[PDB]
Amino acid sequence: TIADMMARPAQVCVERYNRLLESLKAGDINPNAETQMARPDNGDLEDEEKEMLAEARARLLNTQGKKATR
RNA sequence: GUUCGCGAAGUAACCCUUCGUGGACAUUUGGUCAAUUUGAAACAAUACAGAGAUGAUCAGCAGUUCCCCUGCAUAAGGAUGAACCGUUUUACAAAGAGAUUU
Numbered sequence: 138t139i140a141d142m143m144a145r146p147a148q149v150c151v152e153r154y155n156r157l158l159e160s161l162k163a164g165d166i167n168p169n170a171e172t173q174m175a176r177p178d179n180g181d182l183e184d185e186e187k188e189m190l191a192e193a194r195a196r197l198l199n200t201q202g203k204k205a206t207r
Numbered sequence: 208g209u210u211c212g213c214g215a216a217g218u219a220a221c222c223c224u225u226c227g228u229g230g231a232c233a234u235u236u237g238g239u240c241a242a243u244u245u246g247a248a249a250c251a252a253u254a255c256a257g258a259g260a261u262g263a264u265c266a267g268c269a270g271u272u273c274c275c276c277u278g279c280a281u282a283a284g285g286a287u288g289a290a291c292c293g294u295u296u297u298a299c300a301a302a303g304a305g306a307u308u309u
């Protein structure tokens with residue numbers, strides 16, 4: 138409700154509230170992973186990520202049906 | 208062929224026959240169409256695939272069409288019945304700038 142009143146995402150609101158009132162281990166599941174910052178990648182790529190971008194370009198390419206391709 | 212006569216001949220006698228002869232009755236069917244190849248139904252078999260919006264598998268309702276089929280149909284089916292998916296240029300003008308000619 139508060140984040141709706143401020144037109145800001147709620148995770149930003151919670152962390153900034155913690156910063157106002159102030160003045161993770163390994164092997165845990167992070168529930169807040171979608172709201173958190175991304176991880177940039179190692180220089181070459183992983184193999185599964187090469188496969189992912191290949192099939193992603195292949196699925197973003199096609200704009201036809203079965204009848205039209207035939 | 209029937210019927211009403213009108214004459215001759217046979218027996219006649221008023222009938223019954225052969226024969227000629229005038230009238231009456233009855234009066235135009237059928238084809239749009241000829242009997243095996245050359246004037247027009249079509250499917251089915253061998254071969255290939257194995258159904259639209261899909262990443263995959265499907266329910267469908269429509270629409271437009273000089274395509275229709277099954278159906279008693281103005282119902283409903285036929286893969287949502289199917290074809291639909293391509294090719295794409297001019298009602299062409301205004302202001303400014305740079306070179307050629309007068």
Ligand SMILES: [Mg+2]
Pocket residue numbers: 287
């Ligand atoms: Mg249809």
Ligand SMILES: [Mg+2]
Pocket residue numbers: none
């Ligand atoms: Mg139908």
